[PDB]
Paper text:
The replicative DNA pol from bacteriophage RB69 (RB69pol) is a member of the B family and is responsible for DNA synthesis of both leading and lagging strands of its genome. Our previous reported 1.8 Å resolution structure of wt RB69pol showed that L415 is located right below the triphosphate tail of the incoming dNTP, where a small hydrophobic cavity exists at the tip of the L415 side chain.
Replacing L415 with either Ala or Gly greatly enlarges the size of this cavity. In particular, the change of the metal ion A position in both the L415A and L415G ternary complexes are mediated by an alteration in peptide backbone. This could explain why the kpol values for incorporating a correct dNMP by L415A and L415G mutants are 5- to 25-fold lower than the kpol for wt RB69pol. All three mismatches can be modeled perfectly well into the NBP of L415A. The major difference between the two mutants was that the L415A mutant incorporated incorrect dNMPs 5- to 7-fold more efficiently than the L415G mutant. In addition, a water molecule is observed in this hydrophobic cavity when L415 is replaced with Ala or Gly. Our tCo-tCnitro FRET assays show that replacement of L415 with Ala or Gly abolished the pol’s ability to differentiate fully complementary P/Ts from P/Ts with a mismatch at the P/T junction.
Numbering used by the authors: 1 to 901
The structure:
Amino acid sequence: MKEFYLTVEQIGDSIFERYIDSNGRERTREVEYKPSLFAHCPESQATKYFDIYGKPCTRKLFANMRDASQWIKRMEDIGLEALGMDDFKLAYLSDTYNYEIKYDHTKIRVANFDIEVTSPDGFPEPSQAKHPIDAITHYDSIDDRFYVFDLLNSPYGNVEEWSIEIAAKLQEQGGDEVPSEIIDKIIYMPFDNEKELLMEYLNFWQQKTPVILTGWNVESFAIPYVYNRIKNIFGESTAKRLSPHRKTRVKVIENMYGSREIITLFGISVLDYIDLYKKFSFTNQPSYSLDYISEFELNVGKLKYDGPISKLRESNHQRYISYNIIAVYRVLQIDAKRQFINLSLDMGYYAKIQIQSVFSPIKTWDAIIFNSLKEQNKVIPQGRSHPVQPYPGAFVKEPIPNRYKYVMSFDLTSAYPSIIRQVNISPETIAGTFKVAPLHDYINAVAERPSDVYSCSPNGMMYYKDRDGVVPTEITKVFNQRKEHKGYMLAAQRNGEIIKEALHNPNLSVDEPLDVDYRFDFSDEIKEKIKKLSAKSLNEMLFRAQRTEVAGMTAQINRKLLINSLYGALGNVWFRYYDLRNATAITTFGQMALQWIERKVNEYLNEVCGTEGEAFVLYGDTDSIYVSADKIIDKVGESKFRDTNHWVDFLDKFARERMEPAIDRGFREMCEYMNNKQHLMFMDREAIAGPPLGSKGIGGFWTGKKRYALNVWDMEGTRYAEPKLKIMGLETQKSSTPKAVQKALKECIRRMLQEGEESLQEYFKEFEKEFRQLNYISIASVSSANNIAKYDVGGFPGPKCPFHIRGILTYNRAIKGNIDAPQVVEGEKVYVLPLREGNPFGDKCIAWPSGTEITDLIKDDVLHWMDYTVLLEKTFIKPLEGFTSAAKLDYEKKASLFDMF
DNA sequence: TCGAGTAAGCAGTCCGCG
DNA sequence: GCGGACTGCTTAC
Ligand SMILES: Cc1cn([C@H]2C[C@H](O)[C@@H](COP(=O)(O)OP(=O)(O)OP(=O)(O)O)O2)c(=O)[nH]c1=O
Ligand SMILES: [Ca+2]
Ligand SMILES: [Ca+2]
Ligand SMILES: [Ca+2]
Ligand SMILES: [Ca+2]
Ligand SMILES: [Ca+2]
Ligand SMILES: [Ca+2]
Ligand SMILES: [Ca+2]
């Protein structure tokens, strides 16, 4: 097999590389890599190396990496550009793996671990590590085993061994319900003392050294705790054994307020699953506790226990160990579904970077572009410093707030990447500038043609047309991968809808789910077999289809993220190819494209409707238009349609056969106007929206920019078994809005769009009457909590104190003195509740850590003093009043003459 | 919240507005 | 009471 790296590091003048050799075995090597860098030279000097602008360079070969770094510094002292890849390990990977890497994941040791630390006096700080580590569960992907290290004797209690038999039993048997599928995979090791536990863990780690190291909060908690505890007991040299090269660095990480420490383990790639989840999941969660996320992702019940976690080991060591094991398993289950490790490996090997660098699109793209240029013997420019400067973005149309009955939407496929490719925007394709007219003049096609030679953006920039830039070339490659995965995702989605339909008529039989590839649209034969299947088999198939859809979603949306982040990197001062001229060329072209096509669509529809000045485009944001279809439906007449699906078909056909060709003609003209390299503006239909045929539903409404709801029957070619709400920006979509309130507002919206005013009024009246019975967590607001210290003046709110921070200060006074009470962590999320006048907490609100029950010390009093009236008004009535006033509906029945009878 | 970008919405504070 | 200046937070692209 072809060799591939596992990890790479620079340590002084050596590269340390762990790799898989041609026989599939893990090896390590130290290489005295001599890096090269480059300086500009005279034309009279014969060279093969040129910078991206075509200027000749001489290659400087250094005796070692330190010599190279020193040269860069002296070049700065002289005032001359030092060209080339200054991150020497990326140059090493490029030289050592000069081919497309094919990796074999089965050979990569992926370790997933979690530790337990009993602490009586509050949160056990990793930097201090003052308490014994009393459990470690470490799952190894190569062995497929859970290695459990269990401390039986501690200063906080001596306990009996954990029992695998009880662990396996149902909770109704007094057991722990450790999943039966992992029972046989547990290797249990009890220890009489912590010193032996840790020495054995280190010997184990040496034998089975992680390449990828993951878990939940492993980077911020488990790793620094283990390192520091070992350091405290044995000394630094022993703790450094967590690195295969015995090198570690305390790394200080900082944002806007304050900083924290992590331990860099040289020769390991730490991908903390909480951070993978945050970057790649496209959620914003009220809580990031593993319990909360596991419940959300997997629909598994919260791991229940009596009393605080600080007393769990002494009171129920059995459950304590089983819960540690289950926690490790939960992360593996989340990864089986979301596949973020697979994503990271794919992206990392594609770019030829340390796998942990997938968190940085700047590093990822720097490596991709360097590798690409190096292939042509071209030399990358030196990174420079730039001051942070603002630049303009997208155009968003101001919608008239209203109900909108029939709507068809359209938006550009990968808009900004497509603009980059179409215009040929790249650092080395800049050709010059032209005199800019006001944007309105380009939108209306009255400005003079920018260039008859070069490809243009309405910000004034011109680009070469003779050859593709490296940015267009490389962005296209990732875009093509994105397109492939999106195809699989949508097929799985369409397949899911087939199963949902079949589930209306399940067969009374005993059978099996069909063995199929959900990434491909079901054949006629498969469809026929599905119609004969039982509910059990159909539901299993649906689950599998939905898992395939999620897998495709991860692969496609994060490739979309990668290419969109190349655009974004052009506007980040740390990117080697930072250039506000190029970032603004993209955004200004975007503004033109949207407004140009708005004009074209309005013109087209006015023509086919025989009107003048009618605005068919009611809204658009960045690269999208929303077209009112009322007049199209009315041209045929509603009574002509057999059912909802009939008019959906009709609008679908109209969009595909009439609208899209008109849109395409419009953009081709724009391409010619701007003299672009290639027409790539592809504005495909997104949604077909409207009320159910014959209902009183309003179909859709807008309240403002970035705030709307549509009742959708077809989304990008997926014809739903049941209509689905597309809601953007409204409170149902915000993580700050209480859970039960999101749910209620969504049902209000459903009723508005599908059923009408009277249905809405019925539901509202019921919710208002019953909501005080809702569990307090479900009606609590959520907020991130930054700068608690800033607004804390002797335990009381300082000037301009935010509402949620005020709540935290209230909480802090109420739990004062107790080291046992959960502390609100700076920068994390809190639940927030309003409190009635005269309450014993002495302020108008209280906040506590999100994803948790408020501590028993104050729970009863919070429950007694919760201000339900304020809750309802702020979170439910105010937003609902917004939706209904926009839609020109009333959520409460107004008086009429009929009342008199 | 270490980690690519801008536009733009709403909650809340402070305080004017005769 | 609402609206502007401002902070804080969050979402649509
Ligand atoms: C979602 C998103 C969009 N954008 C910008 C670039 C996008 O091309 C543009 C339009 O956003 P989208 O319409 O959300 O995405 P897209 O057009 O790139 O891809 P597709 O519609 O095919 O799924 O907005 C970002 O810069 N960052 C982002 O995270
Ligand atoms: Ca735990
Ligand atoms: Ca788009
Ligand atoms: Ca599309
Ligand atoms: Ca059937
Ligand atoms: Ca869009
Ligand atoms: Ca009490
Ligand atoms: Ca206001």
